[PDB]
Amino acid sequence: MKCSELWTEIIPKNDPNSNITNQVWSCSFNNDGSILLACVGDAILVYDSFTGNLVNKAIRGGQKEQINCIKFSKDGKRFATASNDKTVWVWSFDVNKNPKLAPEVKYSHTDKVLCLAFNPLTHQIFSGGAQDYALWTPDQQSIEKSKFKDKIITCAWSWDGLYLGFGTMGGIIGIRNRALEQLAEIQRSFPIWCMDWTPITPDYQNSVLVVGVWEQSIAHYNIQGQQLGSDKKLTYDPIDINFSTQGEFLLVSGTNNKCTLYTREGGFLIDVATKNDWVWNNKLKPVIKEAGSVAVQDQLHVALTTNDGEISMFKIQQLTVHALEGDKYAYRDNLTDIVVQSMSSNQRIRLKCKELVKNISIYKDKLAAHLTERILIYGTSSEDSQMKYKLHKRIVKKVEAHILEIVSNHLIACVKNKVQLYQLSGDLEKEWVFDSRVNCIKIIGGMPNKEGAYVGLKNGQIFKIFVDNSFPIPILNHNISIKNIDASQKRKRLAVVDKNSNLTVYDLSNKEQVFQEMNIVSCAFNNNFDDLLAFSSTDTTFIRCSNHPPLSQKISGQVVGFKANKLFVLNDNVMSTIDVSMTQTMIKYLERKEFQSAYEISLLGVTDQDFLYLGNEALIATQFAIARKCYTRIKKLDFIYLLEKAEKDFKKNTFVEGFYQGEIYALQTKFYEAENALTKSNLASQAKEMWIILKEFDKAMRITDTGASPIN
Amino acid sequence: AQEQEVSKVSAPPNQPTVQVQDINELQKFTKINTLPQTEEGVDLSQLMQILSPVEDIKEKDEAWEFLQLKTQIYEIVSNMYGGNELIDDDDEDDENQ
Amino acid sequence: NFQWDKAAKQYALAKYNPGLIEAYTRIQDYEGLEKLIAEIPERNELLQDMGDRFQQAGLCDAAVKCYEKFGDIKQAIDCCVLLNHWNLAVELAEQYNFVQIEGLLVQYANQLLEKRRKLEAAELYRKAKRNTEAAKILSQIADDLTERDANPLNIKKMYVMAALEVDLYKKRMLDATMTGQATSTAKTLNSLITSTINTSSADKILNNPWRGAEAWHFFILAQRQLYNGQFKYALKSALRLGEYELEIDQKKIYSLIAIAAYYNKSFRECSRAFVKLQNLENITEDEKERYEAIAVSIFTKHPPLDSPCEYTPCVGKNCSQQVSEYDIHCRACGSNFSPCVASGRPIFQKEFYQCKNCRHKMIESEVSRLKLYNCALCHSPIDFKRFTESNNNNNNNI
């Protein structure tokens, strides 16, 4: 989405009163992409793709005329230089060898050479100029020259290595085989400049010829010569056509001095650059994927050559748009794709679109896709565990908005400093106008046609919006701009992040800055306890409870969502779930004797050992309901019987906690701790009697030597 | 194929072609009925300064929608006040984005 | 175990309201909460709790209902003002004798006016029976529009939304009031009907908010007719403009009348328009001298001659004194004639009907000649033949 220039090298050595000029015609790119080529009048230039500097000095004097085309051999080992000196040179190339480049085999036609092409498989050379076309095979070293009736301008070999396609400025497009026979001929009325063959693809596995005519059209032709009927029209005359690897994109340049990108169907996506002059040649960087390699591959690289003499490099980076509501995570894959992933089974569901997706928003069992001048909505069959998507409705209306959301029976679009409410039919319903740009919006649940929302502005004032009120309600004010906002489970507090990565917590009942934190990338609130706040910095994620020290993990990633005993961490474009131990907050709550909140925390799925510990603690501190709940959530029979005895004896007898502490300790295998606790206050005789029933009369005798019997 | 046909069937003119029928009427109407004013010694051109060009004033039987009508002259009032674009300009959206 | 629906069902079966409220809040299903507030007997703390929950949810109607059932009224006004629910606020203040609401509304309207949102201020005033201030605001907006290109049908659209929104709000209130009424309300409505039968013209004129809309429509129709021949219809339209004389200033109406009268050779109306134009309220000496020069030239080329026409019998009253076709004043009788929004001709025949959106008289012959599928003013998309039949039935009832 963002296009940034990388390095520019200018060639100002214009030579008046000389046929040698400063223009650049072609720019060959290596398959690996570690080296780059360019051709100027009477010279060739070798560049490094990553950094702009000549690895080798400019070669002059080899060809006494201009250089028309420079090409690789798909393997990075050969050079082909065609010149207006009626000659084509073929050079050997090798990076490690002391001579990096050196001429190998030179031949000459009868007239000037205009275009050249290579064979991806057999590495044969086809060079076409005025009045002649020649074929060169490395093994035989005997060229085959044939005459024609008009000068060929463009050539391109098919990716299968079997077919060949050439064009003439007289309007003739010829398709031949490796034997150079008239397999197919097509006659047009306009000159032919750019031709290409669609890359082979497991989904398509069929090759068609894409040719850009000068009557503002791009045509697709089959092998037999029958047109596919596309005949896509253009505003400008095309000049060059290049296909990206795997046949996903198409880089088109020409008139209006703009380099644009398209899908293989013909959908406009972006423009790359405007060079203020004709762009003679633009090329894309090939990519190599390993066996089962995992990578987003969002980065793209293009190389442009302008008519003034500038050879520029541009880098295109695709932004990430995703949505997460519950049990589903819908993120944009490689452009024109939406992937919905479930966090439990890691299963994926793919939805393929033809035009670029701009925003993805998912409501309850409803997914909204925002295509260029189109809106799609899909539902889910709730009864089946697996999700089935069916298109109930489609919106043809063209809407522009950097933020799009869907609520029950309504849609919300944020454009500039305005919020528009759209009916599902398409007609506009309501408008909201704010002072500055609306940066972040959050949707809170509610009744149909009555869903509220939070709005943050560039000024910083946080507002509330209701669907039917049509009157913004000022929530609060912030000096710095707002980047992201969140709301608590019970709508008690609100966490807001500024543009300086500063996190601030505001209480809604009393507008006061209770908590402030520096260098915060993301934050989230729990959906079950309403109090826990998990905020992730660039490297470390912290979880914080009410008036508690923070907890650190050294977890690599950014926090996106927080659920009951679950934290979602998103790295790059893939996200995972991490469980969090709740024993620390349990102990801290037990310290302050807050058994209700401690039990609520323990209810979040903690180990049974902590349940037993909490039950013991509640039983000791005379809280029988929580003790029964803890002793019941895990199937225990002796402890519940002892609890029943304790609750029966609490009303009448003294209920000395020493005896019950000793019994709790003795219910485990720690007999000596129980004996010490029982000897602590004064319960010698009952310790004696409880040790006797275990049939260890000797140790019980050792104990009864010290204890007395105060009866009579 | 059906999308284009249905859209052409309905085609609600939103903003762009609400009343675009602008053709010079200061000269078209002056040829219609001004001849006996110039023929006689009468100068009513001052009175005609009231009359608005008629080509802008459209005369066809269409359908008026309350919501649509609301949106249209809300956009008209916002334009004629001229407040949205000024605060958009001092918003410096391009500088940030 | 965080399974709220089953817990809610069990609580409902076991007759336990606090858990029911908690579960309904968690599932965000306040319809069960409406059932509960209908079910909770009277005057409990749960009333205040559920009112708080409703106010947080933004449904101030239920919040005010809960607050009034609890026994607190000030909190209901606080909810109404905080959520900008001004119709319910006005109703509650009027019924329960609260006075600061008018001041608070004035301050908020002034704040909106300072924020350059006059249309929102007009909406606010329309929400609280303050349509007069909205009318002045709309007149100011029209005057500001006139300073620029000012396509008149935009102003017609604006006045049409004003009237239609007033009608919609009044209809909503009316439907709320009639639904579930008693004997006293029936008697009040019977008295209202009795007064409606014997109504006065001035009261209808004040009530109808379509004044500016129909005035601008008549102006546009007069101009359009004048351009395409049909001078006699343009005369009647300009005479209607002169009749209104409220939104359109005197200059425009009298200039149009003078131009039409000159083009129709009817020089009495031209003379009246010219004597009107010589001094409206203020005029520079050069402009007045130019107008006098135009007048003297026009009236000294040839004397004012009245063209003959047909003096059709009057239908307003039983008087045998016929009235001129163009005249609508109906002097010495006081029975003014209703307009026809089709072409401007006064209703001189039994054939007249109207819609239930703008209630303007309309002649069958004009529709048949023009083939109008919609109402000329409000563009009501309902068939004219069935509407003629309905008006005939209504007249048969009368």
Ligand SMILES: [Zn+2]
């Ligand atoms: Zn009469």
Ligand SMILES: [Zn+2]
């Ligand atoms: Zn009507």
